[PDB]
């Protein structure tokens, strides 16, 4: 496990391949602009097409640049806010 699993339970019901059409993708519900801005195209075209480990790698960069408050509720559910 990782802290990100609690975020992904909150954001995606633990399904890191979710792609529901709501403007967000994968286990931590990146939007496409954030996926691309934090290096995600190196792994896959969208977050939901990347593995959990790759999504977590991009999420780490995203959290460092933008803060846990980018997931204002689900990062709290994981104990990080």
From Swiss-Prot:
The chain holds residues 282 to 362 of 362 of the full protein. The keyword Transport does not apply. It is found in: Cell membrane. One of its GO terms (biological process) is negative regulation of gene expression. Monomer. Disulfide bonds join 10-74. This is Resuscitation-promoting factor RpfB. Factor that stimulates resuscitation of dormant cells. Has peptidoglycan (PG) hydrolytic activity. PG fragments could either directly activate the resuscitation pathway of dormant bacteria or serve as a substrate for endogenous Rpf, resulting in low molecular weight products with resuscitation activity. Keywords: Cell membrane, Disulfide bond, Hydrolase, Lipoprotein, Membrane, Palmitate, Signal, Virulence. It comes from the Bacteria. GO terms for molecular function: hydrolase activity. The gene is rpfB. Its main location: membrane. Belongs to the transglycosylase family. Rpf subfamily. One of its GO terms (cellular component) is plasma membrane.
């Amino acid at each position: 496990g990782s802290i990100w699993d609690a975020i992904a339970g909150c954001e995606a019901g633990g399904n890191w391949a979710i792609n529901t059409g709501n403007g967000y993708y994968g286990g931590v519900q990146f939007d496409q602009g954030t996926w691309e801005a934090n290096g995600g195209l190196r792994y896959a075209p969208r977050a939901d097409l990347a593995t959990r480990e790759e999504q977590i790698a991009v999420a780490e960069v995203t959290r460092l640049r933008q803060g846990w408050g980018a997931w204002p509720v689900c990062a709290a559910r994981a104990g990080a806010r």
